[PDB]
Symmetry: D3
Subunit: 323 residues, 6 copies
């Protein structure tokens, strides 16, 4: 440890002295941080912080998303072995990404959870790192948006991939519900519906609150490039937060989720869209609702890890293009 | 509005109740459990058969798997419909066709009698399988009420028209050969969709194979189905193995290269002008299902069929 | 006038069994009548689908449905070794579930207390299916109202659930600490069986740890339980994680070195002289179950509890 | 000695071959695949039936599951026997009894004829199920050969003696009522082990219930079995649901409170005194199995039965 | 016409037998189990290797999983072909290549010798893996027979051409770098289909990545393949991880955004103009499979390869 | 006290932190992830090998599965011990032994060097497998430090003493005996239920023997056999019946319960325990983590034995 010209074969997440660079791993072993990034709470010189919020108390059907962050970390091992495709660079050579670990909260006092998540995000945002957050159920995005609006102003543009709009009316602000937190976000003025977009939608709301909806059928009909171009058109250059609910994907591709809805996107379609979002002013992102107890050979977590990897690459390109 | 267990508490056959999605009585889409058919528009029932299967068994548990997989569909108005179908359409869950499996020759007449009983009420039947053999006695009873020959709209990897001249045989792969021979269905005005297995003699039934559907798309498939059946009385039978094993792992005879659930639902949703007299959704085998995704796709098909009947009940189509 | 299929929704009487295909039919607990009418009822089975108090894996919210599905074989034959059909003499119904607004978690405790209050007003016994173990605390509140306090608790669990907690908290590991402080249970006349986790302060409750049960045997364990509770009113709470993970993999907090189902059932079946006022069977998490074996073991415990009540109603004990 | 695929390569019915455990032709314990019965001591075959089941289906795939689960048993001499039984005992894998499931009344006579054919060779049959109904037509053929009544040694959570006066029903829970009423088995000289379900009329068959076995132990159970059957021609039928669901989750009718595989194997291994004329191992349902543990326990039972016959042949 | 267990009963290498789909000897598509190669057109064999894997192990059980998954394909004429290929094409199941895993340096020559032996008969090889490393020693033997350099048609999420200058290494991700360096395959006349991982140096092999296939479709892809290989002797190697993890979860290195089985089969079925000299289907890992869907997709690919050979024999 | 991710945040190697059981960094029993061995009593490390397996592969993922399965054990004082071992015993998670799998002849010396390096610190090794072959190079390193011959306490359905450069998880204890690493007369195998023509004079308490005579009789026989000799304990999870340990490469019916196995291990406080491993967990075959959970319990109890021995010294 620390010896001159020490080669780092294995366990880079706990051994690498710098936030930059990859190191050799056996894919089936080694410390399982997200894409093997350094485990640390030190935020100096960091561009992106990956962290987990292991919540499933706000779920309406199956529970299990509390284990989502660990599942996505475990599923990210192969993505660490090679330069991401089609990017063809190692993003960690010039993008400083760490794994913070998780947002602790006291589940047994559930009204403390929302402020715990706001404070977690507030703390990270004081560093000027971007947040890439692994869920956990979709409720987490509401306090994340609160903290993001503090830093980046309001209203924000939301880019929301989901089978569900999560904007069903809820007359109780204090409720812990993964299906009504974007109703609250709109009512709080956190997000601008006319400059926001929901992609892969295939469930019904009497009032989508004026948010642009590109439903699953629309995506299938028009294709990924058309979808990507419509997203760019809607958000323009506004500060945008991207929230990816893995149940956007068809249950064939994402069986490991609490509220599966037939007729969704393939991972190919979703990734083609995410990979093309380089023109967007992406301020923060999350990937939510992975429930490993319902996963099958980790395929859901693997797809979630790919989304997260492509989000990192988008940030690498933004940093490298401004250099 | 009632909170919890609407299937056993609502005094009316109409309307939805508030449920926790992970609890409450598990009838199909939470509809009232009852054997009283008076004023009912659609009867959901199960026929828990797998004795006719040629590969894996397990379809005998299909009806309970489809009921359990229907809980999310009861929470919201179906998409893209945007109505609660149960405000205007009276749908009940009858429970199941009982039969003595240990006397398997008694099974065909038990299914015919189950259907004859329900059809006496003028309700439509939406039947959950069970293996595909069940559709043959169901068609016998439907031909009694609606006349013959019927148009068959058949989603499946398999034609189920392989030759079989033994009448009393119990085979999920030959009952539509028997159906054509009995004059129950008109091959020229029938259509098989998603086919990807070989028969030397498809009996003149129109076939839109899986490769055809992939090449031409859902709208083209839908329009070809409409062209073939026209205004004729039609029975729709959906074998979940129509879908690729990726979308429907939970089935007895999986065949690679099938439809997505997005394709299949796009087709079914567009069939509202068809004179659908009855329907079934078969071959769900929960022992081979993975996180219920097969049963979920089956429940979506069943839900869309109810929405087609709601539009017709309401005078829209 | 024996009915064939779907007895739970068809029998006019609360007494008696019907013929079912084991793989079909309405899935109430042991096929008992689904009803909210408590008149003349001896035991009410209900679910409380909670998992918000869990400390490791979630999933117990689906426990009640899993235990119901797992009870189908128990309905087919007279329970063994009893050799009677308990439902000829004991009126048992399935009430469905306690509804609650999960998104307002502070409302859950009073919802469960009210559910139990309502049922206990009928003088039926409650046999409650969990759900995480927190449900037992509000169940005890309601039971102590009816039957007096302090009650004797017979608690099967790998966990004492008596770890100190100073605060309205929702925790399946601290509710028996609250129960003791509230004066709901008498520690000296209470017993915890299968314990294999550490507490600095077991609150004077008698502990028969898993190793003690293995060393002394089921008969010794039963007799020690009986000695501890004597003739006092007792509530029996069975956390399925009492059983070793080999027998009960489907649970949120599995701990190695537990009881077999043979051991647990030998104990429960022998508790016929105890004044059991109520009971529950908790912590079944079907997402972690394997070929339903956990839910099957839970259903067997519940069945035996019913048989104990039948024997008491019948004057045999 | 041959390397790989001994089941399709060995010219002799005797002897073992070197296999990679994770490859090679999957006959039962790698035995020769053949229909030639000349000079054979034991014929292993499958009857892939699950049409007679009352709860979960799946036992139709039992024989293939058991064969796949037997790979490790072929690698070493069985324990505690410590001999390779195939050096002295000629055992083949016949494959399966074919039947037309779509004509279900043809199944019973197909199984009788399957057994009658093999029994003409004087080999013993070790049959892999398949649901328990298969034991009834197997007993019909065995009674033809060995005389009636036979002694039945029956390991099961279920007595399978519930009344059923329709002879041609296909029911895995009533076929031993038919066997008793037909005079195929002598109830007074038969025994049921691991029982933990209720019948109002056990037909006078001796029952050693699961609780009894737990209380008294394998040695006591074994000795009671011997006392009941004495030297009478005995058929052993092992329903894997005798084992607790923890040990045998892969079965159609799981009942809590069962035997461990340690208990069952200790009993079976001790049966060298029994005049064992034929046996089966039934109700493995691989769709419900978990990491093959049920099929593994079933393959162990079958292996031990082969070892019992090796010992009897030597004595 | 025989009823049941045709793999061990048919005296001729041609023709099909009646099987219960859920029973019967489990050779690949029920073909005769034999090591006799006289008059044989195609030999199916397994190479149960996973020592060369970089992530999950489990491919060692691939050959048995693909054989089990092939039962339905044997019941009907393959679609859309509409003929029984086994009436005109003599296909056998050889069993597996045995190797001493405990001496891993012996594995490569064992596989070369397995292939050399089979190829002396002029039968084509259709080989079931096993991890992708197997294709390297297979290409060595194929180059001995058919000359060097061969055209490679490679379906995979991975190029397997990452640099590796240690000769004796056992690595499923570097063996095609070795194949190119050894002059076994011609990069300019080879093609990799479904690629979605990065290499700084694809060695000039033509790449049609997963995104390209999704954009342009099966017909455009198959036509580009034909254009690249022309009439050169071509070896087809199909890594099941070419398919998206939704269709092929049972594999050691799953990568999102892959092909459907509909796309892959449409391409493979269209390759009748290619001078196909041998083929393999690799990386099925049944411990990670879900209701056999991966092994089923793999069996479908193998079936279609057999139908291509039947057509080429007829031409 | 820290709330969450103690494995990467605690400045001291002693003490526990508050964790949500379903979250936080997944080191073994949440111990500090570090390669600094100064002042360390026990080093937990993984050796993710399955190249030596004879049936199912999958043990390469064993160490990660055992780590993940150890989360509940970190929440409470271990039972029946009733102390937090980490207040007095310094335990770290080193991570894993790296090796180049694609050059398999390099693996044995890599494992030896791994152990040699850790043993230079005087910490004890508790190693998570990985297939059983790992114990052979571990024993080589341990015999270098502690002298030849060692006592072996071996829990397994398999004797691994079948007669035999080879990489084989079933022959490495034949080599160990022939190399003079272990003394068979002062060694013991527990749970055995597979056949060898020559058990090499090692004392065997087979599965049936344990079932017949019980855990107390077994543990007393063990203590008797090994006396005060330096002893290495190797626990193959397939010692347990497949009902308790389905997640393993070579499952054999008729095995021990976790209750039996833990009763035996917990009672081994008189043994001069110099090193230990827990091997053959294959998570691809595990069912609701039960195999990995039993393996984590065995490892926890080994830590508790060392805590007691440090206190008794
Ligand atoms: Mn959402
Ligand atoms: Mn959603
Ligand atoms: Mn069909
Ligand atoms: Mn079909
Ligand atoms: Mn508890
Ligand atoms: Mn507990
Ligand atoms: Mn039976
Ligand atoms: Mn039975
Ligand atoms: Mn490859
Ligand atoms: Mn690949
Ligand atoms: Mn070992
Ligand atoms: Mn072992």
């Amino acid at each position: 440890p620390g010896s001159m010209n020490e080669t780092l074969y294995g366990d880079g997440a706990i051994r690498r002295p710098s936030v930059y660079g990859s190191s050799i791993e056996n894919t089936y072993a080694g410390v399982l941080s997200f894409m093997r990034r350094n485990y640390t709470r030190d935020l100096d010189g960091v561009d992106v912080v990956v962290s987990g919020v292991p919540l499933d108390l706000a779920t309406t059907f199956r529970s299990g998303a509390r284990l989502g962050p660990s599942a996505v970390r475990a599923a990210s091992v192969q993505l660490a072995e090679l330069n991401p495709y089609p990017w063809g660079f190692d993003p960690f050579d010039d993008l400083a990404v760490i794994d913070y670990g998780d947002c602790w909260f006291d589940a047994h006092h559930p009204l403390s959870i929302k402020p715990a998540i706001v404070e977690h995000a507030r703390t990270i945002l004081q560093s000027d790192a971007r947040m890439l957050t692994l869920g956990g159920d979709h409720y987490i995005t509401y306090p994340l948006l609160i903290a993001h609006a503090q830093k980046y102003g309001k209203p924000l543009s939301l880019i929301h991939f989901d089978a569900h709009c999560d904007t069903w009316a809820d007359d109780a602000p204090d409720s812990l519900n993964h299906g009504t937190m974007f109703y609250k976000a709109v009512k709080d003025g956190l997000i601008d519906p006319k400059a926001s977009v929901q992609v892969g939608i295939r469930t019904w709301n009497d009032d989508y609150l004026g948010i642009n909806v590109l439903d699953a059928a629309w995506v299938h009909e028009h294709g990924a490039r058309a979808t990507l171009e419509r997203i760019e058109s809607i958000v323009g250059g506004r500060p945008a937060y991207l929230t990816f609910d893995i149940d956007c994907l068809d249950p064939a591709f994402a069986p490991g989720t609490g509220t599966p809805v037939a007729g969704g996107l393939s991972s190919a379609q979703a990734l083609a869209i995410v990979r093309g979002l380089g023109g967007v002013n992406l301020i923060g992102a999350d990937v939510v609702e992975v429930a490993p107890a319902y996963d099958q050979s980790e395929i859901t977590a693997i797809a979630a890890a790919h989304v997260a990897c492509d989000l990192l690459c988008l940030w690498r390109q933004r940093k490298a293009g401004a250099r």
